[PDB]
Design a protein around this ligand. Sequence first.
Ligand code: CLA
Ligand code: CLA
Ligand SMILES: CC1=C[C@H](O)CC(C)(C)[C@H]1/C=C/C(C)=C/C=C/C(C)=C/C=C/C=C(C)/C=C/C=C(C)/C=C/C1=C(C)C[C@H](O)CC1(C)C
Ligand SMILES: CC1=C[C@H](O)CC(C)(C)[C@H]1/C=C/C(C)=C/C=C/C(C)=C/C=C/C=C(C)/C=C/C=C(C)/C=C/C1=C(C)C[C@H](O)CC1(C)C
Ligand SMILES: CC(=O)/C=C/C=C(C)/C=C/[C@H]1[C@H](C)CCCC1(C)C
Lengths: 39, 210, 194, 165, 217
Amino acid sequence: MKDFTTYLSTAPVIATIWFTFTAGLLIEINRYFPDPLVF
Amino acid sequence: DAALPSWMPGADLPGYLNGTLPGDFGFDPLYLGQDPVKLKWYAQAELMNARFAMLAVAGILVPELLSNIGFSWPGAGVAWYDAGKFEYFAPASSLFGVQMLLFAWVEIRRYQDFVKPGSANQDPIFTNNKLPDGNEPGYPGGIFDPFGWSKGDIKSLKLKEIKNGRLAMLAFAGFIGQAYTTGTTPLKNLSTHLADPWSTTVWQNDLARL
Amino acid sequence: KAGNWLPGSDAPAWLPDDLPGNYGFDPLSLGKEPASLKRFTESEVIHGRWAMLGVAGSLAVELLGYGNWYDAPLWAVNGGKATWFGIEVPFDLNALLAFEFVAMAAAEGQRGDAGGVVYPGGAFDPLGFAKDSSKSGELKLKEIKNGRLAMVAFLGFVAQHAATGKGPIAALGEHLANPWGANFATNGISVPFF
Amino acid sequence: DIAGLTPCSESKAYAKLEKKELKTLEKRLKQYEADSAPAVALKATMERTKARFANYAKAGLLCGNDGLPHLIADPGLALKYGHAGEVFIPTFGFLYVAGYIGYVGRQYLIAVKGEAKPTDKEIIIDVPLATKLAWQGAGWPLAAVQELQRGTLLEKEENITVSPR
Amino acid sequence: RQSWLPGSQIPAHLDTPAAQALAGNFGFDPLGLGKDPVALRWYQQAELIHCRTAMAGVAGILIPGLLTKAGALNVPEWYDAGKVAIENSFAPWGSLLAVQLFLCGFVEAKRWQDIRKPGSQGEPGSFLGFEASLKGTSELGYPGGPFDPLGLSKEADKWADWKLKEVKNGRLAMLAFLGFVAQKYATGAGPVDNLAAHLKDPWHVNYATNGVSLPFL
Ligand code: CLA
Ligand code: CLA
Ligand SMILES: CC1=C[C@H](O)CC(C)(C)[C@H]1/C=C/C(C)=C/C=C/C(C)=C/C=C/C=C(C)/C=C/C=C(C)/C=C/C1=C(C)C[C@H](O)CC1(C)C
Ligand SMILES: CC1=C[C@H](O)CC(C)(C)[C@H]1/C=C/C(C)=C/C=C/C(C)=C/C=C/C=C(C)/C=C/C=C(C)/C=C/C1=C(C)C[C@H](O)CC1(C)C
Ligand SMILES: CC(=O)/C=C/C=C(C)/C=C/[C@H]1[C@H](C)CCCC1(C)C
C-alpha cells in the first residue's frame, strides 16, 4: 500500500485530485449561488 | 485527615483544612480553599457575610413576628421587601450616601487591620483609648466585647458563631427564593406550611405554577 | 513629618521628614525621584497659594452680593462692563487679556528664571514673619495645609456647581435649611440608581 | 450619476434587455408541452434569469446606455457611492487567496530544501507536510509581515547567481 | 501541563520557558503565529490590549443593557446608542472622532515607544517630572505608577493568579463582542433580548432555527 500511496502522491495524480476538488467546489458554489457578479 | 467532626464520616477530606479555622468540617468538593491566601481571604469573607446575614434574618423575622401580636408601631404591615418605598424622615438617597461614607470608614479600618493585625487598634482622636494587643483579623474584641464574653470558651463560642452564620446565610437565601417564587412574606409561608405540611411543599407549589 | 495619612502604614522611604506637610501620602510613588519631587513641591505650593486666593475671592464676591463665582465673566459673554466693588471698569475682554498676559508672563518668567525658588522672602516678606528659621517650618506646615484645603474646596465648588447649578454660598444655606433633602445624593447625577 | 451612468434599477435599456431574454426563452418554450423535461428546464432557466436581473438591480449596479452593468474600479468612488462590492472587496479577496497559495508553496519549498533529495519531494508530493502547511497558511499575511520585519524574507545579494555582465 | 487539546502535539515554541511565563498558556497555536519570539511578544501585547478593550466594551454593553431590562436605567441598544448619543450632543461625530484620534494617538505612540524599548519613557526632562512614573514593571504590558492606584500588583503570590483572571476574562470578552455582532446580524435584537428569548424556549430558539447560521438546513 506504501507504493500505491507513493504513486498517488506523484505530481500528476495530486494535480488531478486537487484540480477536480477545486473545480467541483467552484461548480457547486456557482450552482448554489447562481450568477454571482458582485459581493 | 484527623479526628475532628466531618461532613461525611469516612470520606477522604482535603488536607489543607487542619481544624485551625472555626467550624472546620472538611467540606470543599470544589477545592476552593486550596490556596492559603485565598482561604485566608475567604475566612474573613465568610465571617463578615455570616454576621451580616444574621442581622438580616433577625431584622426580617422580628418585625413580622411583632406585627402579628398586639404590639404596634408605624411600619408593621409592610413586608421586608416593601420597606424601600416607605415614607421616612429623609429620602433613601441621602441615607444611602451617609451609610456609604460611614461603611467606607469602618471597612477601610477593618481592611487596614486585616492586611496587618494590630495596625488599627488605636483610636485616632483619643490616644488613650485602644484595643488589646492580642488580636486577630475578624475578631476585634476590646470595646467590641464590653462584657468580656470571649474570655471563656472561645472555641465553642466561635463554633456557635460560624454555625449560626451559615444557618442565617441559608435562611436569607431561602427568604429571597420564597419571595421570588411565592411572592409573600416568609412567616406567611411558614404558617401556610404549618397548617397542612403534606400539601404545602416546594414541589407542589412549583408544580401548580408549571 | 506632620503625621500619617493611613494609620498603621509605614511612610515611604523617599519622602524627607523635614519637608513641610509630610504625611507619608504617596500611594502612586510619583515623587520617587528627587528631581521630580522638587518640581512637584514648588508646583504644590504655588497651587495652594493660587487656590487660597481663588477660594477667598469666590467666597468674598458671593458674600458681598456681587454674584457667584460662575457669573463673573458673564458680562463679556453678552456684552457689558465689569464692576469691581460696584465701581465701573472701562476695560473690555480684548484689552484685559493683553495686560494680564503681559504682566503674568513677566512675573512668572522672573519667578521661573531663579531655578524653582519656593520660599523667596525678602521683598515678598516686608513684615519679617520668617526672620528666624526655627519657626519658619511651622508656618510652612500651616501654609501647605491651608493650600490643600483650598484646592479641595475649589474642586468642591466646581463639582457642586456642575451637579446642581447654585453657588457655594447658596448651596451652604440650602444644605443648612434642608440637610437630608439637599446634599450630594439629592442632586440626581451622583447616584443614578437613586 | 458617476461618469454619466444611470443605476440599473432605473434604466430602460436594462428592462428591455431583460424582456428580450425572457421573450426568446418563452418563444422557445412554446414549442414543448407542459409536463415535459425540456419545459421544466426552460422554466428553470427563466426563473434563473429573473433572479439574476432582480439581484443585479438590487445590488445597486450602474448601467450604461447599452443596458449592461458597469464596474467602479476607483477606490474613492466605490467607497463613496456604495460600489465597494464590485472592485475592492474581490480585490482583497484575491490578494488573500493569492498570498495564501504563494505562502503555502514557499513554505513547502523551504521545508523540503534542507532534506537529502528535494527533487523527489518536488515530483512526488509529501501529502502530510503539504496538508499541514495548507492548513497553517491561514495566517499568511501575519507570517509574511513578520518575515519581512525580521529580514528573513529575502536572500542576500552574495548568495544569488548573476551573469558575468 | 494544561492544554487546549489533551493529546495534541504542543508546539515547541510554546514550550519554551519564556513562552510558559505568559498568563493563560494552553498551547494553542495551530497556525504557528508565535514561532518568532519577537512576533510572540508583539502578539502578547496585542492580546493584552484586546483583552482590556474588549472587557471595557462588553461591560459597557452588557451592564447598561441589563439595567435597561430592569428599572435601573433606560440605555438604548449598543447598535443604536451612537445615534441617540450624537443626536442631543455638543459636537458632531467627525469633530469628536478627530479629538479622539489625537488623544488616543499620543498615548498609543508612547506605549509603542515603550514596547520598542522597555522603560524608555523615563527619559529625564521629557514629561515635566512625570517621566519617572511612566516606566513600567519588568514585564511588558504591565505598567505601574499612575496606573494601578490601589497597588494590588505588589503581592507576588497573587500576581501570577491575578494575570490569569485578566487574560482569560478578556478572551471571553473578545468572544462576547463577537457574539454581539453575529447576533445583531442574525436576530435583529439586542444581546439581553436574545438571552431572554432563548431562555423562554431553548429547544426552538437558537442558531439552528434562525435560518441564517445554517442555510443548508
Ligand atoms: C491606482 C491609481 C489611482 C488613480 C489613477 C486614482 C484616481 C482618482 N482618485 Mg484614487 N485612490 C487610489 C488610487 C488611484 N486613484 C488608492 C490606492 C486609494 C486608496 C488610498 C485611493 C483613494 C481615493 C480616495 C479616498 C479618493 C480618490 C479619488 C480619486 C479621483 C480624484 C482624486 C485624484 O486624482 O487624486 C488622487 C487620489 C488620492 C491621492 C487619494 C486621496 C484623495 C484626494 C486627496 C482627492 C480628495 C479631494 C476631493 C474629494 C476631490 C473631489 C473633487 C470634487 C469631485 C468634489 C481620481 C479619478 C477621490 C474621489 O474622486 O472621490 C470619489 C477621493 O476622494 N481615491
Ligand atoms: C511556490 C510557487 C510559486 C511562487 C511563490 C511564485 C512566485 C512568483 N513568481 Mg512564479 N512560477 C511558479 C511558481 C511560483 N511562483 C511555477 C510553477 C511556474 C511555472 C508555470 C512559475 C512561473 C513564473 C513566471 C514566468 C514568472 C513568475 C514570476 C513570479 C513572481 C511574481 C508573482 C507572480 O504571481 O507571478 C506569476 C506566477 C505564475 C505565472 C505561476 C503560478 C503557479 C501557481 C499558482 C504557484 C503554485 C503552484 C504549485 C504547484 C503549488 C505548490 C504545491 C505544494 C504546496 C505541494 C513571484 C515572486 C514572475 C517573475 O519573473 O518575477 C517577477 C514571472 O515572470 N513565475
Ligand atoms: C498627592 C497625590 C499623590 C498620590 O500618590 C496620587 C494622587 C492621588 C494623584 C495625589 C493627589 C492629588 C490631588 C488630590 C490633586 C488635586 C489637586 C487640586 C484639586 C488642585 C487644584 C487647584 C485649584 C486651583 C489652583 C484653583 C484656582 C482658582 C482660582 C485662581 C479662581 C479664580 C477666580 C476667582 C477668584 C473667582 C472668580 O469669580 C472667577 C475666577 C477668576 C476663576
Ligand atoms: C488565537 C488564534 C491563533 C491561532 O494560530 C489561529 C486562530 C484560531 C485564528 C486564533 C484565534 C483568534 C481569534 C479567535 C481572534 C479573535 C479576536 C477577537 C474576537 C477580538 C475582539 C475584540 C473586540 C473588541 C476589542 C471589542 C471592543 C468593543 C468596544 C470598544 C465596544 C464599544 C461600544 C460600546 C461600549 C457601546 C456602544 O453603544 C457601541 C460601541 C461603540 C460598539
Ligand atoms: C505655552 C508656551 O509656549 C510655553 C510656556 C512654557 C514655560 C513658561 C516654561 C518655562 C520654564 C520652564 C519651567 C523650564 C525652565 C525655563 C522656564 C522659562 C522657567
